[PDB]
Structure 1
């Protein structure tokens, strides 16, 4: 009665259409890959690179299991090129594209039966092209069990990977160039050039390129590596702003001695279409905290212990007996933050006593109101909620930072604008971009709409002084493609969603910033 009931279209608006993937290829100085899939210029260093890349999982501790492993999609001819005795490629799900062969067919091609069953799990045939394979890998059985998908070969498989719609799911291209001169490469590999129609809006850029290396295979073969990624202009908005703040921001010092460089007034835009999730890649975002806290906000929770008991300690400091008493909130039990955030969202203006009270039906439930409006009159220009309540600020452990959000609808897509008065560019902003992206996605799922864009307006945007050096280190990283968000299951009510109901896939953030802590 007080909860928000999810429509029957709850799962259809965010169903992953195609799984994201990477492409791995070896070419010669002329762009040629080979004829019917040749390899006579076999460079042991490349084979090992290929093996490590496609087999290893990110979790530097995890070993490939049917529950968590990488996938390799290949054309039939590529599968045939593999010595029958060495099929399938171990430690990976072998997805073979074929319009004649079948899963059993591929299986029997393998000699001994001891493995004709030990690998019955590691092989699957797809009657179609790359797109169908990615569509299949997008199903519950493979996503998220499959950590990363690698398109490994076939001139026709690469060509489909490099054109729409598949290219929009291409996270990276790993190209090895063997400087061996052979003409036995009837087909060439071409990465769409920046700004051309074939590129379909994507700007391919090298993240890395090695120096010229020499093989230890006797031929002294010259070869080098390249990692190409689709330029992420959205994350560059955030980096450009950080750099501008450090270069031109005003330095200020807290009454406690804390310093910051800052600018006033900025705005950034992020797409939420097709399951895209704007989790910054140049520095890992604590997604689990983001998700737990957001759900916490939606349920109009005010007791920080619920978050603390989940390993999310972002409210510890402002939830202690000391801090609370410093605010004159002596009757508040520790971790009881008062009518903050989510409380104003679901109960704007409701009198607060203790987090223990039952606030059902109290105050103005702005979220419920926006949900109903979105479903009946999406063009309404008053669809916004705020936590900024001058009358309740004194009763809060702390005044809200992200205090206002407005929704907008166009062509069945739901867009959201968030206003944040104070923005810690280092830790907070990436976190908050994630929260509202998640919020927008959930609201879309509650209103029969598709997630659109997240607009982020910043007031006082700052970088802490003793964050400058580590921030400069991060500013050196070229943003990678964003990950995607999928839901394992749905719920009857919005307030019933749990962090375990959704999963973030294909998130490959850069390593932690080496903030030389000592030594």
Structure 2
């Protein structure tokens, strides 16, 4: 089935992954160098064996395509994926007045949830409405929207990296230079998340357009379900904006790890029988994907198994 390379990659890390400590002081079971491919013409690979909310994928991808780095856009699409990183520059802030030394304390103490949630909804709210606050605690700076569409140049000017390569696909469909990169050597030593999705490159041969991701690091239970979808989505969109048909998404990993928290959750997923894969319908009369809205992308026939709850 379309999603079987995931299940395979989750299995193989179980069966032969070696133990590895991490930045997080949770353990992991880990492998270096893996490649799964997905023939995007046989359907769309939103995993069926575990529910992955496509709505969350698309808003966040449309955030990136817009060159936006503000938690606000996300927030009016009921998308909280990036919420904690904005809250953090808030709880540290010199003018903060409310105790969140906070992610390490989610499950850790239930009575935190109350006043975490309270102080987190009290902040989401005020990003939504109060512009000064939003401009200040809601803008995440150097996350994929800037790297892709406004990469901070050395002359202080700003490069439209992704736009430029789409022109380049329109124009020189065959070059092997069709690279968008999110790895800024100038920024990775001191930056909240050095990007996991470090690079990708497009490729065109005889009608179809494919994309490969180099992902330096992959939480296989939480991160990879979303990650595969966002980047297969990206491929379709560009295929679309360029009039090409879609071919492959290739997912390449450096460190592909299962957290030790996630051991039971994965085995459970692994008993689930995957279901026929949904189809993606992009709106056939709009092409300038920098101009897509939620309704321009629709997912026919996703029939997932239930979500499996997971210690981040």
Would you say the 8 A contact 1:265–1:457 is kept in 2?
yes
Distance in 2 of aligned mates of 1:283 and 1:448: 32
Where 1:334 maps in the other structure, the secondary structure is helix
Cα distance in 2 for partners of 1:240, 1:323 equals 41
In the alignment, structure 1 residue 420 sits paired with structure 2 residue 224: no
Query: Aligned partners of 1:369 and 1:258: how far apart in 2?
Result: 40
After superposition, residues 311-390 of structure 1 pair within 5 angstroms as: 311-322=78-89, 325=92, 333-350=136-153, 362-390=157-185
Q: Are the counterparts in 2 of residues 486 and 502 from structure 1 also a CA contact under 8 Å?
A: yes
State whether structure 2 residue 27 is matched by structure 1 residue 259.
yes
Tell me the CA shift for residue 302 of structure 1.
Answer: 1.0
Which residue of 1 is the match for residue 41 of structure 2? 273
Query: Which is helix-richer, 1 or 2?
Result: 2
Q: C-alpha displacement at 1:323, in angstroms?
A: 7.4
Alpha-carbon distance in structure 1 between the residues aligned to 2:286 and 2:307: 35
Structure-1 separation of matches of 2:242 and 2:47: 27
The number of residues matched between the two structures is 269
- 1:489 deviation in Å? 5.9
Q: Distance in 2 between matches of 1:464 and 1:478?
A: 23
Given the alignment, which residue of 416, 421, 443 partners 2:238?
Answer: 443
**What is the aligned partner in structure 1 of residue 55 from structure 2?**
288
State yes or no: 1:496 paired with 2:291.
Answer: yes
Query: Following TM superposition, by how much is the alpha carbon of 1:476 offset from its aligned partner in structure 2, in angstroms?
Result: 1.2
Counterpart in the other structure of 1:89: none
Choose the corresponding residue for 2:7, options 226, 229, 239.
239
Measure the CA separation in 2 of the matches of 1:428 and 1:419: 14
State the Cα distance separating 1:430 from its structure 2 match: 1.2
Which segments of 5 or more consecutive residues in structure 2 lack a partner in the other structure?
94-134
Query: 1:21-40 to 2 correspondence within 5 Å?
Result: none
Instruction: Write the distance in 2 (CA, Å) between the matches of 1:252 and 1:492.
Output: 45
TM-score by length of 2: 0.79
Mean Cα displacement is larger for which, 386-395 or 503-512?
386-395
Once superposed, what is the RMSD of the aligned Cα atoms?
Answer: 2.4
Q: Which residue of 2 aligns with 1:509?
A: 304
Q: 1:310 maps to which residue?
A: 77
**In structure 2, how many angstroms separate the alpha carbons of the residues matched to 1:448 and 1:482?**
23
> Residue 484 of structure 1 aligns with which residue?
279
Q: Distance in 1 between matches of 2:34 and 2:65?
A: 26
Question: Is the Cα contact below 8 Å between 1:490 and 1:497 reproduced in 2?
Answer: no
How far apart, CA to CA, are the structure 1 residues paired with 2:24 and 2:233? Answer: 35
Instruction: Identify which of structures 1 and 2 has the higher relative contact order when contacts are C-alpha pairs closer than 8 Å and 6+ apart.
Output: 2
Distance 1:412 1:319, change over 3 A: same
Runs (5+) with no aligned partner, structure 1? 1-231, 327-331, 352-358
Helix, strand or coil: the match of 1:409?
strand
Identify if the C-alpha distance between structure 1 residues 514 and 407 changes in structure 2 by more than 3 Å, giving closer, same or farther.
closer
Q: What is the Cα deviation at residue 297 of structure 1?
A: 0.7
Offset at residue 334 of structure 1 (A): 1.3
Aligned-partner SS, 1:320 = helix
Query: For residues 425 and 399 of structure 1, what CA distance do their matches in structure 2 show?
Result: 18
Instruction: Evaluate the alpha carbon distance shift between residue 256 and residue 366 of structure 1 in structure 2; reply closer, same or farther with a 3 A threshold.
Output: closer
8 Å contact from structure 1 (residues 401, 421) kept in 2: yes
CA contact (8 A) 1:342 1:387 kept: no
Larger mean CA deviation between 282-291 and 481-490 belongs to 481-490
2:234 equivalent to 1:467:
no
Report what 2:251 is aligned to: 456
Q: With the length of structure 1 as denominator, give the TM-score of the two structures.
A: 0.49
- Distance in 2, matches of 1:305 and 1:485, equals 27
Change (3 A) 1:382 1:325: farther
Q: Is the 8 A contact 1:304 1:316 kept in 2?
A: yes
Displacement of 1:422 in angstroms is 0.8
